[PDB]
Amino acid sequence: TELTDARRYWVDVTLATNNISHAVIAEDKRQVSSRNPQIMYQAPGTLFTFPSLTNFNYCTGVLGSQSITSGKHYWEVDVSKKSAWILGVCAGFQSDAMYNIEQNENYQPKYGYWVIGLQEGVKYSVFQDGSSHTPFAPFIVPLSVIICPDRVGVFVDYEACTVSFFNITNHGFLIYKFSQCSFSKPVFPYLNPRKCTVPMTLCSP
Q1: HEC sequence for 110-174
Q2: Fold (CATH) for 1-205
């Protein structure tokens, strides 16, 4: 029901190539993954190695080719076999340096970030606003996921200022929903493999 009504605003979303992420967007702009060329042709010795220069973080964030400033929008993302990824809605990477967001996965709605993430394979969580005393760290909240989602549906109601996440694999049951979102700027669909080499696609009806 709630998912069927949201599917009424199904839009064709295409990724936009940016020069601030190490992500790899397909030619059709309908698929994105992680890993970068051979190995950044840098090989700290063992090629892939384990970039300790900043390990535990790859920094691969991408947005949509079209911005959202009104009306409702809905699109699905296929994260099958993926052990980690970040998807939802973003207002851009304008405030990514000030709070080393992408660098330290500092996703926060106050920074223009309304997304959810999965890590380790079975660790789902929702990024929320964190204490100002520690601006370089978000308030990650663990989500109770019983049926690992093989496809997530994102619904955005600019007018209502809300971002919902549906579990297509779970009868399309609601996973999380951002309410009273500060939609004062143009938002775009956020996607992030999260070091995960497994590509995340966007169905498209």
Answers
A1: HHCEEEEEEECCCEEEECCCCCCCCCCCCCCEECCCCCCCCEEEEEEECCCCCEEEEECCCCCEE
A2: Jelly Rolls (2.60.120)
CA distances from 204 to 22, 44, 73, 115, 125 (A): 24, 39, 12, 20, 25
Kindly list the distances between the CA atom of residue 187 and the CA atoms of 88, 143, 201, in Å, as whole numbers in the listed order. 10, 24, 20
| Lookup: tokens for 3 | 């998912």
What tokens were used for 72? 């409702």
Give the CA-trace dihedral at 41, 44, 48, 51, to 10 degrees.
-120
Cα distance between residue 101 and residue 105, in whole Å: 5
Rg, the chain, Cα only: 16
The CA-atom distances, in angstroms, between 180 and each of 59, 81, 86, 158, 160 are 28, 33, 21, 10, 8
Main-chain phi, psi angles of 29, to 5 degrees = 60, 35
What residues contact residue 87 under an 8 Å CB cut-off, 6+ apart?
A: 77, 79, 115, 116, 117, 152, 154, 189, 190, 191, 192, 200
8 Å CB contact between 47 and 39:
yes
- Going by C-beta distance under 8 Å and a sequence separation of 6 or more, which residues neighbour residue 143? 116, 124, 125, 126, 175, 176
Burial state string for 80-107 with b = 16 or more CB within 10 A and e = fewer than 16: eebbbbbbbbbbebeebeebebbeebbb
Handedness of CA 128, 135, 187, 90 (dihedral sign): negative
